[PDB]
Amino acid sequence: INIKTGTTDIGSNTTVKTGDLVTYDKENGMAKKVFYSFIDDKNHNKKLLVIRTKGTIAGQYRVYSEEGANKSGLAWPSAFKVQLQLPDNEVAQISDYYPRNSIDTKEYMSTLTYGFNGNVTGDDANVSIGHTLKYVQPDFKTILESPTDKKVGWKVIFNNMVNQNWGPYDRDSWNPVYGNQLFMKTRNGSMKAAENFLDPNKASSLLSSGFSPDFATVITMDRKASKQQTNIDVIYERVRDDYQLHWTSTNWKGTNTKDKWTDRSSERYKIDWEKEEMTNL
Numbered sequence: 001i002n003i004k005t006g007t008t009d010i011g012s013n014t015t016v017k018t019g020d021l022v023t024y025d026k027e028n029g030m031a032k033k034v035f036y037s038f039i040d041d042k043n044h045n046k047k048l049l050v051i052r053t054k055g056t057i058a059g060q061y062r063v064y065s066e067e068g069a070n071k072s073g074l075a076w077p078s079a080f081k082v083q084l085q086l087p088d089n090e091v092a093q094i095s096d097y098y099p100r101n102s103i104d105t106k107e108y109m110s111t112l113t114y115g116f117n118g119n120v121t122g123d124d125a126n127v128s129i130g131h132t133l134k135y136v137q138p139d140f141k142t143i144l145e146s147p148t149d150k151k152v153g154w155k156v157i158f159n160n161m162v163n164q165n166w167g168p169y170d171r172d173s174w175n176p177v178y179g180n181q182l183f184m185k186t187r188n189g190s191m192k193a194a195e196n197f198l199d200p201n202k203a204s205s206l207l208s209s210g211f212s213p214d215f216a217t218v219i220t221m222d223r224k225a226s227k228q229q230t231n232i233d234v235i236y237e238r239v240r241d242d243y244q245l246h247w248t249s250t251n252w253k254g255t256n257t258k259d260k261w262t263d264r265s266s267e268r269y270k271i272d273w274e275k276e277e278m279t280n281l
């Protein structure tokens, strides 16, 4: 892509060594790309590591069940989560993360720079490193989760949605006749439940296709520290709700159980600050 790998001198006796890693999780419908950047400033007491987490999480919007023509279930992704976590015994600390706060915009973007003070600062502080964050979240919201020096996590959760001019609806919508009409195609149509689900092409590309995260986590590591190797766990995660259409005696009625299924993908990475390398275990 536009993300280069290699080593550049970004000035003031500072080097940016960048590499990449890829792991396919075909079971969970996940391609998990990681671009890492070692910012080694000879004038700073700490080496910096930017872990740009990328790839694709397929939405896997699909009809999973059918009981005659009066009942059917639907699995739809209600949340995409990326998390990074450092075990407790480690010396390394999470100094910074992007997005830094909640993002309600359908598009997020940020260009990461190094300010030669040991601080990575995002704008949308002088010279750029090779990363410009960009991701899209139609009908979705981004939320930061319990950030500490040992764990950071982003949660891209479903917000609201217009349903062929009926909407807007969310996971909590209710109607005394039709219940939750989120993905309900027709209110009184004559067809099998399996066929009365909204076309995913008429909705968020996070539902039909999927979500492509682009988050940066910054890790600081003291040079004088004894143990100069570090483990870090990176988790990609999909939460899928269960939307069921049941034919009542008169009309169609929808229900939505939250967070019924959660598919969790996890990889461990060895960080070597001296060799400035990142590898899978």
Ligand SMILES: [Cl-]
Pocket: 175
């Ligand atoms: Cl209504």
